[PDB]
Every structure is written in C-alpha cells, then in structure tokens.
Structure 1
Amino acid sequence: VTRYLRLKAPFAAFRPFQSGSFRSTTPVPSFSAVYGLLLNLAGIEQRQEVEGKVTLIKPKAELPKLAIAIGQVKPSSTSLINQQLHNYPVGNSGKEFASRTFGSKYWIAPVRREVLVNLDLIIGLQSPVEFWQKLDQGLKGEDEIYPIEKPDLASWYCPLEPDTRPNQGACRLTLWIDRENNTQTTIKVFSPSDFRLEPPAKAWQQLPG
C-alpha cells in the first residue's frame, strides 16, 4: 500500500441489500460503499448516470483499478430509532392511489430500522500517484478525515476459510453489486482479526471495480 488515512463519524447506517419489510444493519460498511465514497470524495463523477425506472448499469471497461482493505478501532453498539416510512403498494392499488399518479409514493405505513451509535475507520487505499494526487486536490484544491497512517494501528478484517473459528464476525458483506439480474458478489462472510500489527496481505483485496 502507498498510504492510508483515518476518519470518524458519529452516525451512519448500512442497509442489507433488500433486507425486507423491516430493515437491519451491519457493524461495518460494505466494500462497494467505501469504494464509492472514496471515488466521490476525489471529485470523480460517476461514469454512468443514465435515467429510467432504475440506474446503476456499470460496465468495468472504463473504471479505475485499485486494491482496498478495511479496519476497525473501537466496537460500537446499535439502536433502533424510527416508527414510520411509507412504501409503494403491491396489489389492487385501488381508488385514489390510481387517481393521483403524481410520482405516487402513497400509502404511508409504519416501519422501524436501526442506527449505529458511533463509527471510526482507519483504512486507506493502494493506488497510483496520480489518483492520490487528484484525491488530495478534491479534498484540498481548486465529518473529518486526515492521514495518520504510521501510528494508531488497530484490528482488521479478512475473509475466513473453513477453520479457525472466529468471534463476532460480520454475517454478510458486498464486494461489487449492480441493481440488475446477476450473481451479485461471491463471498459473504468476513472475520475480524485483533492484533496491533500491520494487517496481512490477505486483508488487502484487489477490487474489480
């Protein structure tokens, strides 16, 4: 890796991909979300932004190549703070609903979901010099994030093989997802490793995106 930078945030939420009627969350963000956040923070606009019923139709032909890991310093708890969020009905969709048709989003119904009390992340990116330079220009050029790479090292994550039973692992995770018919991502489960030493090469994952 070239260098890595640290950040923290008080509140966040990471929905499982089509969790269901009742939402849920995961202790750590997905790799795809982190990749998108880093791409946007550099000021790189999305490669494709066509419009229609849906979006996110992304070929890999023109897209930066890069390798990302993930880290974690302090465990955080979870809470549930919501009572309502409307939806789009399935069924008759009778009476007025069919009468209005104004970007409908009618039939408000109650539903709850989860939030994270606190969040802090440490990992950065292994990338060529030009990409890091333009990322710095996007951050500084024409909540809070800053590089403390060498000190302040904490635990990390890594894919797990059928041995060495881990503790408090993440149930599911996403690598590269497109909102269409596909095979989604291959590996789901991940395992945390606790040691104040540089993460192993297995922790680094070369992202296809």
Structure 2
Amino acid sequence: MIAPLILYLDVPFTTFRESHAREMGKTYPVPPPATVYGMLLSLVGETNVYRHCGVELAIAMLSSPKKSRILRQMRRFKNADFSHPENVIPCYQEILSNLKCLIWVRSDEEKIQPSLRERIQLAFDHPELVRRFGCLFLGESDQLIKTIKLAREDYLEGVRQWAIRDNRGRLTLPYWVDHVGSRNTRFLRYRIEEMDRLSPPDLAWTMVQSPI
C-alpha cells in the first residue's frame, strides 16, 4: 500500500472554536478533523465537501500551543438595519499561538478518483497547476498558514503528542460540521497522549464521513 502522505503544518495563530461555544469563542486544543479536512479541500481547490468523504486523517502535535484571549467587536445579524448598534457585540475569542503539527493523510477508503492524497501530492508537485481561490488558512480567514510542506516521519525527529480516539477522552472534536445548526455535526472523543512513535497508531486515524 502507498505510504500515507505527511503534511507538516505551522500556523502563527489558530482558532478552533467549539461547536457549542457561541456566547464565547472557546477554542479546541487541537485542530478538529473537520477543520483539517476543509483546509485540505481548500488546498486542492475542491469546493464540494462530499467529494473526498472517506479520507482518514491523523494529527500529531509537535508542541503544546498556548491559549490566549483577545477581545473582538464581532458583528452579527440581529437587526435589519446594518448601522444599528445592536449588530456589534464585544466578546472574547480564544486563540492558539505557534501551532506546529504533522498531518497524516490516508485515502484508502475513497471511492472517487483521484483521491485526496493524490490531489495534495500533485498540488505540491506542480503548484502552478493548482486552481484555487483565496489564501490558505487554518481556522479563521485571517489566520493564514505560515508553513505547509511535504515532510517525512521524522521532520523534527522528536516527541509527538498524538490525538488518540479514546471514548474516555476529554476533547470532543467534530469530523463533520453543520454550519447552520448542530443537527448534522458528528463528534468523536479524543485524548492527547505523549508518545515517541514516528507513525500514527491505529486509533489515531479519523475517517471523514457524511452524517448520513
């Protein structure tokens, strides 16, 4: 079998807001599989979200990012008038600083060719042939990606904080997100285990599937 594609990721600032965190911008410690899947789709310029269902992703944290809060005058659709003062509310948003991680992409379960792994490999091979819009970001549109590159299993050859699918884990990261409400959002429970493995364990792989 083809070795799973490894994508080194370095982001200066990242906000993985929680699904139920609407009054305050609480963030996940680790990028959810849904956010990484959306980032990869943006990287290959794929607008359709159902195109690459079945891809498996594994995330290894190269360091523990620090959590910080920033005030923000975020807008909302509360009043019909755009200039009404009710449309602006001040609330906190939690950000993560200096996020470095390695992403494993495995595309054995995809039924549509070419697979997401092949598309990412081709995009990195010939960047001038990639047809996409906007700037690559992880989280919010203003949180641009500093370094995204093809790496090996030992890019830093140090110690890795894996995200293991544990039913007793603390984090509840979604592998599918319903942006309207929460009906179609699908969750999985993870834990961050400090391990010196250079390849993801079996429980570290998360398959992105439709809620159906």
TM-score, length-scaled by structure 1 = 0.73
Partner of 2:136: none
Matching residue of 2:162: 156
Give the superposed CA RMSD.
2.6
Relative to structure 1, the CA distance from residue 191 to residue 43 in structure 2 (aligned partners, 3 Å threshold; closer, same or farther) is same
The amino acid across from 1:36 in the alignment is G
Partner of 2:128: 141
Stretches (4+) displaced over 4 A = 103-106
Residue 15 of structure 1: aligned partner: 17
Among 96, 108, 119, which residue is 2:99 paired with?
119
Query: Cα distance, 1:11 vs. partner?
Result: 0.7
Q: How far 1:72 sits from its partner (Å)?
A: 0.6
Aligned to 1:110: 90
Match of 1:192 in 2: 192
Gap regions ≥5 residues in structure 1: 48-57
SS of equivalent to 1:141: helix
Distance in structure 2 (CA, Å) of the matches to 1:83 and 1:40? 26
**Identity value in percent:** 22
Superposed, 1:89-100 pairs within 5 Å as 89=78
- Residue 149 of structure 1 deviates from its aligned partner by 1.7
Cα separation, 1, equivalents of 2:104 and 2:85: 42
Match of 1:174 in 2: 174
Secondary structure class of the residue paired with 2:176? coil
Distance 1:109 1:17 in 2: 19
2:36 equivalent among 34, 37, 46: 34
- SS state of the match for residue 39, structure 2? helix
Structure 2 residue 186 is the aligned partner of structure 1 residue 201:
no
Report Cα offsets for 1:150-184 as digits up to 9, x if no partner. Answer: 3135221112145xxx7xx43x2111122356253
1:66 positional shift? 1.4
| Residue of structure 1 aligned with 2:26, choices 6, 24, 35 | 24
Aligned residues: 179
1:156 partner amino acid: W
- 1:88 equivalent to 2:74? Answer no
Aligned partner of residue 124 in structure 1, secondary structure:
strand
What amino acid is the match of 2:193? S
Corresponding residue of 1:71:
60
1:40–1:83: structure 2 CA closer, same or farther, 3 Å change rule? closer
